[PDB]
Homo-oligomer: A and B are copies of this chain.
């Protein structure tokens, strides 16, 4: 009856009907100050990144084994892993269907490069966590550029095809990608819904700092390894991170990162919409 399209996407629409997710759209419209894409073409870019992003979120909640998203049951907690995995993979390819409409020969070439960049990120993020091998500050920064720069580059990259603007923004995109992950990492451990990263066992920016700062100690890995829901251990864990100064080390990097963005944002000629956003996200750093 062709309603099959409806049935398959209930898990996908479930995540959309959930609150939040404001940032993805703001960057695409804020970067448009330079790129200035046509309203017709721009709508395509926004719609596709919205799809890909949410689709990746369905997968990431299984990979992280998250129990709650935006305060609601994870999609697969209601529909089950088979239905969620398939629905997300379907959304992926629905995106490629839309990208082909861009009508640009290079849309497919760029779409492939960025998705592979993204999956190598989530691939490393999983390899380190699931093989209990801690990454250095150096590697972590590098895979984050893949993981979160993947969806950024796709949106700004696609826009670049239709713009007469030829100067390169890859440096600003990188700095923003890091600013986002490290901010989300910092907020995750600082302010139910308490230290969600400690239960998932992931290596966040502060936990990575504590692990190398105290080589003689083996406490942070033994707590991360437990994937504990126990608050008292988490409470102690946050205390330790404060004692070793891991929160102080992150802020100074964020403040350091924040500077590069303004310096880089000014050098491209300025975008008032974008500066307002950085000042905003940074108030909690």
Contact = CB atoms under 8 A, between A and B. Distances in A.
A232 interface: yes
Contact of A97 (B78, B112, B218, B221): B112
A230 B78 CA distance: 11
A263 to B, nearest CB: 29
Given A90-B119, A123-B86, A77 B6 contact: no
A281 interface: no
A10 B100 contact: no
Interface in A67-86: 67-68, 72-73, 77-83, 85-86
Contact of A80 (B116, B221, B222): B222
A236 B79 CA distance: 13
A191 interface: no
Interface stretch (A21-29, A57-65, A270-278): A57-65
B14 A219 contact: yes
A7 B14 CA distance: 33
A93 B116 CA distance: 6
Contacts of A59: 85-86, 89
Contact of A96 (B10, B97, B112, B217): B112
Given A8-B119, A100-B112, A126 B86 contact: yes
A144 to B, nearest CB: 14
A248 interface: no
A4 interface: yes
A100 B122 CA distance: 24
A219 B14 CA distance: 9
A79 B222 contact: yes
Given A7-B123, A85-B85, 8 more contacts: A8-B124, A63-B81, A64-B82, A94-B116, A97-B113, A97-B116, A100-B108, A100-B109
19 contacts: A4-B120, A4-B123, A6-B216, A8-B119, A59-B89, A63-B82, A72-B236, A77-B230, A79-B130, A79-B222, A86-B119, A86-B122, A90-B119, A92-B92, A93-B119, A94-B116, A96-B115, A100-B108, A192-B232
